[PDB]
C-alpha cells in the first residue's frame, strides 16, 4: 500500500506517542477518568 504524506505523518506521530519515554507531567494525562464517572 501507498498512503498520502499527511496520513503517514499522523500514523508516525501516533506510534511516536507510544514508543518514546515521556516526562511524568505528561502521561499524567491519558491516565484519565473512566466511562461511568
Amino acid at each position: 500500500v501507498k498512503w498520502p504524506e499527511y496520513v503517514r505523518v499522523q500514523r508516525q506521530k501516533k506510534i511516536l506517542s507510544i514508543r518514546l519515554k515521556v516526562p511524568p507531567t505528561i502521561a499524567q494525562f491519558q491516565y484519565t477518568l473512566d466511562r461511568n464517572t
Binding site: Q12, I15, L16, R19, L20, K21
Partner: protein, 115 residues
C-alpha cells in the same frame, strides 16, 4: 575454543571504540595532552541531546535524529593530521602508483613543450 569466542567480544568492542572522526580526535588530544581530564568531559557530556531512548524506537525516526544531532565542537589541525595518518591504508602509495604518478607528471612536462 572458549577464548576463540571470548576474544572476539573484545575485537568487536575495539571497533565501536576506535576513533573515526576529527571531532572525536580533538577530544582524544584534549585528554592526551593535559587540557581536559575525565571529570571535565563528564560535565561536557550533558548536551542538548542527553536523556534520549534509542533501542525501542523505529529506525525511520532515529535515522533522522542522528543526522541532525551533532554539536559542532571546535577542531584543530593537530587532530586532522593524526586522523589522516590513521585512515591511510597499506596499498595507498605502492611503488606502482609512485612510478605512475611520475608517468603522469612527465606527460604534463611534455604537453607544455607541445605549444
Amino acid at each position: 575454543s572458549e577464548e576463540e569466542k571470548n576474544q572476539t567480544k573484545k575485537e568487536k568492542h575495539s571497533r565501536d571504540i576506535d576513533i573515526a572522526t576529527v571531532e572525536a580526535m580533538t577530544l582524544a588530544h584534549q585528554l592526551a595532552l593535559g587540557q581536559k581530564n575525565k571529570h571535565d568531559l563528564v560535565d561536557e557530556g550533558f548536551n542538548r541531546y542527553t536523556f534520549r531512548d534509542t533501542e525501542n524506537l523505529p529506525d525511520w525516526f532515529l535515522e533522522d535524529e542522528k543526522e541532525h544531532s551533532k554539536i559542532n565542537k571546535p577542531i584543530t589541525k593537530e587532530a586532522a593530521m593524526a586522523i589522516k595518518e590513521k585512515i591511510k591504508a597499506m596499498n595507498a602509495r605502492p611503488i606502482k602508483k609512485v612510478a605512475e604518478a611520475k608517468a603522469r607528471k612527465r606527460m604534463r612536462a611534455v604537453a607544455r613543450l607541445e605549444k
